[PDB]
Design an enzyme around this catalytic site. Structure first.
Site, PDB file in Angstrom:
ATOM      1  N   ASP E  44       6.714   3.113  -4.912  1.00 20.61           N
ATOM      2  CA  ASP E  44       5.273   3.321  -4.915  1.00 20.61           C
ATOM      3  C   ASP E  44       4.783   3.560  -6.340  1.00 20.61           C
ATOM      4  O   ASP E  44       5.340   4.385  -7.070  1.00 20.61           O
ATOM      5  CB  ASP E  44       4.911   4.502  -4.017  1.00 20.61           C
ATOM      6  CG  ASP E  44       3.413   4.673  -3.841  1.00 20.61           C
ATOM      7  OD1 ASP E  44       2.642   3.828  -4.342  1.00 20.61           O
ATOM      8  OD2 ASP E  44       3.006   5.659  -3.190  1.00 20.61           O
ATOM      9  N   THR E  77      -3.977   0.809  -7.470  1.00 17.74           N
ATOM     10  CA  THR E  77      -3.858   1.813  -8.523  1.00 17.74           C
ATOM     11  C   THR E  77      -3.191   1.229  -9.762  1.00 17.74           C
ATOM     12  O   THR E  77      -3.680   1.404 -10.884  1.00 17.74           O
ATOM     13  CB  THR E  77      -3.079   3.025  -8.010  1.00 17.74           C
ATOM     14  OG1 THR E  77      -3.771   3.606  -6.898  1.00 17.74           O
ATOM     15  CG2 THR E  77      -2.933   4.066  -9.109  1.00 17.74           C
ATOM     16  N   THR E  78      -2.071   0.527  -9.577  1.00 17.30           N
ATOM     17  CA  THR E  78      -1.395  -0.106 -10.702  1.00 17.30           C
ATOM     18  C   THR E  78      -2.143  -1.332 -11.209  1.00 17.30           C
ATOM     19  O   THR E  78      -1.914  -1.754 -12.347  1.00 17.30           O
ATOM     20  CB  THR E  78       0.031  -0.497 -10.311  1.00 17.30           C
ATOM     21  OG1 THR E  78      -0.007  -1.399  -9.199  1.00 17.30           O
ATOM     22  CG2 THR E  78       0.834   0.737  -9.928  1.00 17.30           C
ATOM     23  N   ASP E 361      -5.065   5.084   5.928  1.00 14.54           N
ATOM     24  CA  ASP E 361      -5.085   3.991   4.962  1.00 14.54           C
ATOM     25  C   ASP E 361      -5.486   2.676   5.616  1.00 14.54           C
ATOM     26  O   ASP E 361      -6.060   1.805   4.951  1.00 14.54           O
ATOM     27  CB  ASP E 361      -3.719   3.857   4.289  1.00 14.54           C
ATOM     28  CG  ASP E 361      -3.409   5.015   3.362  1.00 14.54           C
ATOM     29  OD1 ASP E 361      -4.347   5.754   2.998  1.00 14.54           O
ATOM     30  OD2 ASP E 361      -2.228   5.187   2.996  1.00 14.54           O
TER      31      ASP E 361
END
Lengths: 71, 69, 78, 148, 493, 70
Positions: E44, E77-78, E361
């Site tokens: 993750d 996010t990345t 989610d």
């Protein structure tokens, strides 16, 4: 052996085997330690010669049964 | 600001794995070798079990950590 | 499984012990098997070549009297 | 001795639970490594580039029969060619004959006559278990040192 | 001087250096070495960043900006860090060697962000928000590669019932229009229910309480129980007949149900027993606001001030029937009281805890489709399609900002190149062919992760909502400009 | 390029014909060496395979490197 400080743990194997002779029979403690030290010297030539230590152990098991019957 | 990449891990991970492999290589099979492991307890213990070998030795290499699990 | 962890001389001794250990405690049915029900006793006195299988249960502290009988056959446990 | 007894009870435990049994002494590893190599060449249903990495998995399963003879001092290449010669004669005939490595004599052996058998549940999770562990080690490009 | 500007770009690259291969569904696993001897093998992206200890202060700014995006959306996010990290790499020779003023680069990123959002709106495709079958392949992005892949068919029905219940169009130009007006926080809050089955899980609308009956002999079935809310419990009043008087004030309306926030003494249980009303204690304060909305009983502090306006209408059942060896209480009814309570049931508590985070989610991705009724192509197709439009608009600018504006297109091509580096193919050969397919292919040509050959996205149907693509490029520019705003770093209190 | 050539040679055997395959460096795929015009002499490759085999085999035959004469 109880009054000596042992450094290498491999030596303790012979010390524990020496006490086996004193507890049960009580006689022959010198015969156990001296003979066990010579079995390693005659095996040093076999380990170097290229004979695997596995068949070296198997050879002593076959030679031990032949000796017990002759006693 | 360059796109050059590195390995630096897999070569070390395999090398660290080959070191642990040779420890348990001779310990496998009925014709294998029996090794003595004593850490701090002064208690002589000889076993060929791969799980017991890793639990009685503290390995700093991260490669052997996943193998221990 | 035995020949791997020993020198193969002890396997012939433990062959009838390990084989009869599971079959005696486990009756033949669907059921299941429990290895926790098999007790394990450790003794440093006698040599490993003289080991034997124990069908029942063994205890640590027994009664000490000089006149106690050596062998009692068909004894009642209370 | 306590380690040999606890390992023996858990090995027999899977014999009564699971009705399937597999022969040991490298009989399963040599047959699986030879089958997977000739299966993808005939079918050709995976990929051209993927079969390069598949060959590495087939060659990695032959280390076990080479390890058993390595500790005994026997030539691992000699015992490997003797098993392959016996498997070739078994493929021509329509019967079923299993071949395994004999450590005492050094030649091949019949694992059903010798009596070397391994649990099915142990070997089923051995292939799948070693696959995920060895794969995760190849997925790390850079070692991360942090937390202090 | 200029040394602090170099460290700001270096610190941003060092953080993105770890997540280089962490982008995409093919992202590999990382090994984090802890000083205590522990390791973390999770792949993750945002879970590793919280455990990374950094020195340079600009690296801490990237962790705080990624933490904010992690709460709003579960993925991407990345994506923001890699996109914003490559902007400083392409603008590094422009800021130093070319001697370009930093605000001009910042102003160029502001104008490029406006043109980028316009291209995203053009490449977007219309999608039906009311179609239940269309929302299955969308939410599946947060479903697959998880334990819920088998129940995915049932997980879609649980997510759509919670979103469609609390959404309100209210379209008009007077006071402003929230699109569907979704509230995830308060209304969609989920309480796990032990025992049961996942296939039988249904969406309840109301408030659920696990507290059982506090009296040994009481009616276990009530036709129409009327909820009465209060603050001060029933007991002898102390400074910082009296107990019976507090009960008579509630009985003025003769209620068939009494719910107390705090505990109830055994003296008040006998007084309310003859009145034919159930006593329920041990109720949290946060639930009292939701109980009043699903019932309509006015929350009152002092019992003597309790209004008669309370109503017990819209109460489906009183049934206390045991589920999972524990007596429950179900306030669910056949109408929507502007809220709902999702009831998750399973074969163990570990499965319920996994469905919890996954369902939240899953509905977060579901809301992303509801908020913006459009989809964008995934797998590097959106990132490459915008870079093609940036090269065409760079010729019409005719100014000093043209040089930093062209550097954005080079950073837009890093995301599709990232998936190729993890694919194993030749990055130079694929990026050259992929760029030519967007001109004559109507941006329908994406990248296949499983195979690795360049194919169109119309067949496999890989699509992602627009709000994720908008917030990804919007935060990246705000993160890249913020690092350029600081030209000097000092220490000391 | 290794997979495309091996897959092309297998399809040529089932078609019962003779088709030569070679590596095309410009495009990157395979090519027909007769059409492209790439040809090597017979005497060049005869001594190349034979020469490289005898010299490389003699390197593995060396048991120990002796230093003498100084």
């Amino acid at each position: 052996l109880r009054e000596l400080d042992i450094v290498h743990p491999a030596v303790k194997v012979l010390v524990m085997a020496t006490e086996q002779q004193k507890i049960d029979m009580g006689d022959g403690t010198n015969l156990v330690m001296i003979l066990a030290g010579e079995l390693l010297n005659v095996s040093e030539k076999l380990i170097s010669m290229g004979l695997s230590a596995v068949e070296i152990i198997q050879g002593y098991n076959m030679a031990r049964k032949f000796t017990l019957k002759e006693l | 600001a360059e796109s050059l990449r590195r390995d630096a891990a897999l070569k070390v991970n395999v090398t660290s794995a080959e070191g642990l492999q040779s420890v348990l290589e001779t310990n496998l099979g009925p014709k294998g070798t029996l090794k003595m492991l004593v850490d701090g307890a002064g208690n002589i213990k000889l076993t060929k079990d791969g799980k017991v070998l890793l639990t009685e030795m503290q390995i700093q290499s991260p490669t052997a950590v996943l193998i221990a699990r | 499984s035995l020949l791997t962890k020993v020198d193969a001389d002890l396997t012939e001794v433990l062959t009838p012990i390990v084989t009869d250990a599971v079959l005696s405690v486990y009756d033949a049915q669907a059921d299941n098997l429990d290895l926790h029900m098999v007790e394990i006793m450790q003794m440093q006195h006698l040599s490993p070549k003289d080991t034997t299988f124990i069908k029942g249960l063994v205890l640590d502290h027994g009664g000490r009297h000089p006149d106690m009988p050596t062998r009692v056959k068909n004894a009642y446990v209370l | 001795t306590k380690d040999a007894v606890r390992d023996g009870l858990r090995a027999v435990a899977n014999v009564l639970k699971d009705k399937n049994i597999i022969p040991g002494a490298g009989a399963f590893y040599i047959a699986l490594s030879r089958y997977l190599r000739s299966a993808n060449m005939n079918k050709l249903g995976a990929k051209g580039k993927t079969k390069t990495g598949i060959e590495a998995f087939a060659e990695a399963l032959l280390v076990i029969p080479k390890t058993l003879v390595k500790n005994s001092g026997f030539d691992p290449l000699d015992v490997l060619a003797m098993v392959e010669d016996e498997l070739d004669d078994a493929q021509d005939s329509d019967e079923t004959r299993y071949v395994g490595v004999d450590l005492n004599i050094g030649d091949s052996c019949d694992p059903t006559i010798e009596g070397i058998w391994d649990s099915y549940r142990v070997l089923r999770n051995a292939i799948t278990g070693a696959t995920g562990i060895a794969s995760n080690l190849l997925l790390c490009d850079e070692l991360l040192r942090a937390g202090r | 001087g200029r040394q602090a500007q170099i460290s700001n770009i270096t610190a941003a690259k060092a953080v993105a250096d770890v997540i280089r291969t962490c982008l995409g569904p093919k992202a590999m696993l990382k090994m984090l070495l802890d000083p205590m001897g522990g390791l973390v093998l999770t792949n993750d992206g945002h879970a590793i960043l919280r455990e990374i200890d950094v020195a340079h202060p600009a690296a801490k700014s990237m962790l705080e900006l990624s933490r904010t995006q992690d709460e709003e959306v579960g993925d991407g996010t990345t994506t923001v860090i890699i996109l914003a990290g490559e902007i400083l790499a392409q603008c590094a020779p422009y800021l130093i060697e070319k001697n370009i003023h930093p605000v001009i680069i910042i102003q160029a990123l502001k104008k490029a962000l406006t043109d980028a959002l316009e291209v995203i709106k053009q490449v977007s495709k219309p999608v039906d928000v009311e179609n239940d079958a269309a929302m299955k392949k969308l939410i599946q992005a947060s479903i697959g590669t998880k334990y819920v892949i088998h129940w995915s068919e049932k997980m879609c029905e649980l997510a759509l019932d919670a979103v469609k219940t609390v959404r309100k169009d209210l379209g008009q130009t007077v006071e402003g229009e929230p699109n569907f007006e979704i509230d995830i926080k308060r209304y969609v809050r989920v309480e796990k229910i032990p025992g049961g089955d996942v296939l039988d899980s249904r969406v309840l609308k109301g408030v659920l309480l696990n507290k059982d009956v506090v009296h040994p002999k009481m009616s276990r079935h009530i036709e129409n129980p009327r909820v009465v809310l209060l603050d001060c419990p029933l007991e002898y009043k102390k400074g910082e007949e009296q107990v019976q008087l507090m009960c008579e004030q509630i009985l003025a309306v003769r209620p068939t149900l009494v719910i107390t926030e705090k505990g109830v003494s055994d003296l008040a249980q006998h007084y309310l027993l003859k009145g034919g009303c159930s006593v329920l204690r041990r109720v949290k304060k946060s639930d009292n606001n939701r109980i009043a909305r699903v019932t309509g009983a006015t929350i009152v502090n002092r019992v003597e001030d309790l209004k008669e306006s309370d109503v017990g209408t819209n109460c489906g059942l009183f049934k206390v029937e045991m589920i999972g060896d524990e007596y429950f209480s179900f306030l669910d009814n056949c109408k929507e009281p502007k809220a709902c309570t999702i009831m998750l049931r399973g074969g163990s508590k570990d499965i319920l805890n996994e469905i919890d985070r996954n369902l939240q989610d899953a509905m977060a991705v579901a809301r992303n489709v509801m908020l913006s009724p459009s989809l964008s192509p995934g797998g590097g197709a959106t990132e490459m399609a915008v870079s093609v439009k940036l090269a065409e608009k760079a010729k019409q600018l005719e100014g000093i900002q043209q040089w930093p504006y062209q550097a954005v297109a080079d950073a837009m091509e890093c995301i599709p190149r990232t998936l190729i580096q993890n694919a194993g193919g030749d990055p130079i050969r694929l990026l050259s062919q992929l760029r030519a397919k967007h001109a004559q292919g109507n941006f329908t040509t994406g990248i296949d992760g499983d195979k690795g050959k360049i194919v169109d996205m119309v067949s496999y149907g890989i699509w992602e909502p627009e709000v994720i693509k908008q917030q990804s490029v919007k935060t990246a520019i705000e993160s890249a400009c913020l690092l350029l705003r600081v030209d000097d770093i000092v220490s000391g209190v």
